[PDB]
Design a protein around this ligand. Structure first.
Ligand code: CLA
Ligand code: CLA
Ligand code: CLA
Ligand code: CLA
Ligand code: CLA
Ligand code: CLA
Ligand code: CLA
Ligand code: CLA
Ligand SMILES: CCCCCCCCCCCCCCCCCC(=O)OC[C@H](CO[C@@H]1O[C@H](CO)[C@H](O)[C@H](O)[C@H]1O)OC(=O)CCCCCCCCCCCCCCCCC
Ligand SMILES: CC(=O)O[C@H]1CC(C)(C)C(=C=C/C(C)=C/C=C/C=C/C=C(C)/C=C2C=C(/C=C/[C@@]34O[C@]3(C)C[C@@H](O)CC4(C)C)C(=O)O/2)[C@](C)(O)C1
Lengths: 73, 131, 160, 61, 217
């Protein structure tokens, strides 16, 4: 039984200290081990100050938002 | 059984939900729970049900809505009369300039306009609570 | 709407133009309260035309600033342009406080005793209806009288 | 500028300008006082605050 | 098959906005103002409101989209700064009534008088500057105060007015107490006449201060 958002599905970030808070990014993969605290891996078009466009988030920090659309983060 | 991160998060949620309810009770005694701090004064609840309780208007809490409405309109009339009869009609400036004295009735009445404003506010607050 | 107070001797349910054949109970209560209030106002009004005319004419001023005196104010229609306007607005106030001190207990005007403004009712229903009908008949007559005194005042200069 | 940015949702198009599209938007900008208002009232200019980064966190504990 | 996330590991999302209570609280009890929780419905209820007629199209005529600004409030600052269509209709009919009175007032005062005399564009400023038997200003102002203190339009700003817009319950001589009488048609005629009187009053006001603007005075 798959857990978390599907691969390639857009999710809105709910981590307040994240550089992409309330932004959206494609789900690269979700780790299926229940022991992993932050299994969801999300990649973004906008890099942060460390020039990193991907990060691993918790299961409770992604809400499966729709596609961004024209001129929308 | 091993404690997965989901189980730890579940314990976090249970602990927070229980403790946030417990600390509101009479068994936590934090300085932020003193009188003059966040909680309302014991016998004088200000806001309940998202409506100004009758205790907001202080000593007027026992007044009826009709009494407050009558006082509000009467004070509005008297204070507006005083202001208009002191500023524009029957000016007192020339009379007091030549050594005279103010018409004390005008001065006393003119202070009843903001009193009337707050009186009609209190009338509405009383009407909301059904008093 | 017959069997309600108001139908006594010279006419029964009087309505020539209807206005109550609809049977709206809420409408009748408001009309009844209006009819009684007008009468009650008119009855004091008819007293207000008789007394200052013949005598009374309260000693004093009624306006110390304008130097008016009660004797100066003409009786009847001409007063409402001679009584200082501050007096009329205060009459509206004294009416209002009693409009919000004479609270209504049931459906139609009540809660003052015979005219006692805590007095109690007339108890015996025969007197309860007889006095209530007497108030209505007196009030209606005064209503017709005060407009007649208004017309008489206009027709013949002063109030009489 | 806003029209070009909306129609080129890529960083590659900001360093290497799509000149035909750029001049197309430049010529199309004359009707801005009407198109901009029609976008304002029809919910196509602004974006709800819950879709862009509000700012730094000020609380959590 | 995707496993359902337990409530322990669910998400808060951002359904909780600045216009509503947060996790658990009650909003501030404001007196008569925008109260209660707003919901987007202005444009939708605007397409059901009557007033549209064949002079301009036949559907809901609103270029500039002033109706929709309430629905946008949620996108903008998430605050109902712009009124709902219910408040807009209340303003519609209030302006219409006031104009239908005011236009014939302008006409009558230029041809009628009572026992002070001063133009029409300076009649009020004169009456507010020379009281001799002019308690009529007091009576008119207290009537206005009582009327729109009693008939203050509830919570029309956020579209939650229980009273139908413009329905003050003033139908003394049973003019349209009929079950429908096409009450839509009577209301439409009222709105058309109110708009016409608004245009007339605007024409007169703009002409008196811009000479030769509107044909005839
Ligand atoms: C403000 C003035 C006023 C008002 C509101 C009323 C109101 C009323 N009168 Mg009335 N009346 C008045 C002045 C007034 N009266 C005067 C001045 C007279 C003297 C001519 C009468 C003589 C009169 C009679 C003889 C009767 C009424 C009756 C009524 C009631 C039913 C008639 C109706 O539909 O009313 C409009 C109603 C409560 C009837 C009643 O009591 O019904 C039970 C009735 O039989 N009236
Ligand atoms: C209890 C409060 C109260 C107070 C302080 C006053 C005070 C006053 N009243 Mg008054 N009045 C009251 C209650 C009160 N009244 C009540 C309950 C009534 C019954 C309706 C009246 C009816 C009344 C009349 C009819 C008139 C006054 C007038 C006046 C003023 C006369 C002095 C003057 O001419 O200038 C110094 C004076 C300031 C007179 C006035 O304002 O004339 C300009 C006037 O004509 N009063
Ligand atoms: C002179 C004729 C007259 C008569 C016969 C009455 C008779 C009556 N009035 Mg009345 N009244 C009168 C003139 C009169 N009034 C005037 C001129 C006024 C103006 C001040 C009033 C103001 C008045 C009030 C304010 C009330 C009465 C009430 C009553 C009734 C007493 C309560 C009762 O019996 O049932 C019980 C009684 C039938 C009371 C009533 O209707 O029921 C309580 C009441 O509340 N009267
Ligand atoms: C019960 C009330 C009442 C009484 C006793 C009178 C009494 C009188 N009226 Mg009268 N009147 C009344 C009500 C009343 N009126 C009403 C309600 C109206 C309005 C329709 C009039 C309109 C009226 C006129 C137009 C005239 C009278 C005239 C008269 C006198 C003859 C007499 C003194 C006449 C009069 O006084 O002539 C000098 C006269 O010309 N009345
Ligand atoms: C928006 C409405 C409006 C407003 C704010 C005013 C305001 C004013 N009018 Mg005016 N008037 C109006 C409508 C209005 N009028 C209409 C519709 C007429 C035609 C009947 C008149 C006829 C009129 C005359 C003849 C005079 C005034 C005058 C005045 C001034 C003194 C107040 C007075 O005595 O009014 C009196 C107003 C009336 C008698 C009209 C009342 C009709 C109401 C508005 C309709 C109610 C309908 C109701 C449901 C039945 C004051 C600035 C006086 C003035 O100073 O002249 C410059 C004056 O001599 N007015
Ligand atoms: C229903 C209650 C009521 C009563 C008893 C009065 C009574 C009065 N009004 Mg009045 N008035 C009323 C309602 C009322 N009005 C309403 C609803 C309006 C519209 C806002 C007005 C507008 C009005 C004006 C504009 C004027 C009066 C004036 C007057 C006085 C002259 C007498 C008269 O009207 O000739 C019968 C009188 C005291 C006049 C005045 O100043 O008298 C000194 C005056 O100029 N009234
Ligand atoms: C700060 C302004 C303010 C506030 C918060 C209130 C609040 C209230 N008024 Mg109110 N009122 C005000 C000013 C205000 N009033 C003024 C200036 C007047 C004219 C003198 C009135 C006349 C009035 C009446 C007649 C009644 C109320 C009533 C009420 C209550 C409920 C109905 C309501 O809000 O509709 C009225 C709301 C308004 C008229 C909105 C005006 C205020 C807005 C918010 C802002 C105005 C300031 C700006 C211009 C240098 C190129 C409520 C407590 C009713 C009640 O139950 O009171 C007892 C009622 O019947 N008001
Ligand atoms: C073109 C004139 C016109 C028309 C057609 C209407 C039509 C209407 N008005 Mg309206 N009104 C008008 C002018 C008009 N009004 C003006 C100038 C005022 C200011 C005094 C008002 C004040 C007013 C109030 C305060 C109320 C209405 C209401 C109503 C509705 C029920 C009353 C009725 O049977 O209609 C009257 C039909 C006529 C033919 C009258 C014209 C006679 C000349 C109806 C849609 C009531 C309602 O429910 O609103 C939705 C209500 O409470 N009106
Ligand atoms: C008190 C409440 C207890 C309950 C009793 C209640 C009825 C009171 C009515 C009397 C009015 C209050 C008296 C204030 C003194 C006063 O009027 O001075 C009398 C003053 C006049 O004052 C005199 O005027 C002279 C004129 O030349 C000079 O200027 C003098 O110097 C000045 O003293 O007049 C007024 O203040 C007029 C305004 C009255 C406004 C009342 C209208 C409101 C009516 C509706 C309200 C209820 C509606 C619900
Ligand atoms: C379906 C239906 O019917 O619904 C209706 C039913 C209801 C509820 C009953 C109803 C109502 C009530 C109504 C109409 C009230 C009517 C009011 C009438 C007012 C009367 C007045 C002003 C009296 C006068 C007296 C005057 C005197 C004038 C003179 O002194 C003058 C100057 C000069 C003198 O030389 C000559 C003079 C001649 C002596 C004057 O000029 O005026 C309502 C609300 O309308 C709805």
């Amino acid at each position: 039984p798959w857990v978390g958002p599907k691969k390639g599905s857009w999710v809105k970030i709910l981590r307040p200290e994240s550089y992409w808070f309330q932004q959206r990014g494609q789900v690269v993969n979700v780790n299926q081990k229940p022991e992993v605290k932050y299994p969801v891996t999300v990649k973004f078009d906008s890099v942060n100050y460390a020039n990193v466009n991907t990060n691993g988030y918790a299961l409770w920090e992604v809400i499966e938002a729709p596609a961004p659309g024209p001129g929308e983060v | 059984y091993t404690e997965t991160v989901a189980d730890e998060r579940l314990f976090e949620q249970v602990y927070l939900q229980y403790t946030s309810e417990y600390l509101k009770g009479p068994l936590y005694w934090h300085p932020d729970k003193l009188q003059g701090w966040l909680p309302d004064y014991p016998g004088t609840p200000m806001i309940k049900e998202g409506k100004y309780t009758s205790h907001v208007i202080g000593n007027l809490k026992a007044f009826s809505s009709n009494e407050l409405a009558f006082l509000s309109m009467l004070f509005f009339g008297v204070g507006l009369y005083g202001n208009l009869q002191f500023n524009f009609y029957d000016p007192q400036w020339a009379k007091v300039d030549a050594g005279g004295f103010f018409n004390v009735s005008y001065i006393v009445e003119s202070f009843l306009l903001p009193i009337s404003f707050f009186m009609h506010i209190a009338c509405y607050i009383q009407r909301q609570n059904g008093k | 709407f017959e069997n309600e107070l108001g139908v006594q001797a010279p006419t029964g349910f009087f309505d020539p133009l209807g206005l109550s054949s609809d049977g709206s109970i809420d409408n009748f209560k408001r009309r009844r309260a209006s009819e009684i209030k007008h009468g009650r106002v008119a009855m004091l009004a008819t007293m207000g035309y008789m007394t200052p005319e013949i005598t009374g004419k309260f000693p004093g001023y009624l306006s110390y600033s304008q130097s008016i005196k009660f004797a100066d104010v003409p009786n009847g229609l001409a007063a409402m342009s001679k009584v200082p306007v501050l007096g009329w607005a205060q009459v509206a106030a004294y009416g209002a406080v009693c409009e919000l001190s004479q609270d209504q207990s049931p459906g139609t005007p009540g809660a003052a005793g015979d005219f006692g403004f805590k007095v109690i009712t007339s108890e015996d229903e025969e007197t309860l209806k007889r006095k209530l009908n007497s108030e209505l008949a007196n009030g209606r007559l005064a209503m017709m009288a005060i407009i007649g005194l208004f017309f008489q005042d206009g027709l013949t200069g002063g109030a009489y | 500028g806003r029209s070009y940015l909306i129609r080129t949702n890529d960083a590659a198009k900001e360093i290497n300008i799509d000149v035909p599209l750029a001049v197309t938007c430049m010529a199309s900008g004359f009707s801005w006082p009407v198109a901009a208002w029609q976008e304002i009232v029809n919910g196509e200019m602004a974006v709800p605050n819950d879709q862009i980064h509000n700012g730094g966190p000020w609380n959590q504990s | 098959x995707x496993x359902x996330x337990x409530x322990x590991x669910x998400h808060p999302k951002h359904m909780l906005v600045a216009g509503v209570r947060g996790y658990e609280m009650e909003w501030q009890p404001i007196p008569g103002d925008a109260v209660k929780y707003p919901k987007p419905n202005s444009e939708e209820m605007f397409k059901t409101m009557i007033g549209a007629d064949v002079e301009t199209g036949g559907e809901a005529w609103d270029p500039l989209g002033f109706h929709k600004l309430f629905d946008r409030n949620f996108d903008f600052n998430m605050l109902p700064v712009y009124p709902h269509v219910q408040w807009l209709r209340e303003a519609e009919i209030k302006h219409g009534r006031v104009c239908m009175l005011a236009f014939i007032g302008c006409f009558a005062q230029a041809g009628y008088h009572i026992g002070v005399q001063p133009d029409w564009s300076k009649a009020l400023a004169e009456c507010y500057a020379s009281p001799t038997g002019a308690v009529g200003l007091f009576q008119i102002s207290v009537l206005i105060g009582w009327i729109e203190g009693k008939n203050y339009n509830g919570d029309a700003w956020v579209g939650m007015s229980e009273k139908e817009p413009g329905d003050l319950g003033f139908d003394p001589a049973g003019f349209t107490k009929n079950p429908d009488f096409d009450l839509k048609k009577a209301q439409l005629q009222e709105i058309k006449n109110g708009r016409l009187a608004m245009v007339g009053c605007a024409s007169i006001a703009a002409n008196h201060f811009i000479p030769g603007s509107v044909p005839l005075l």
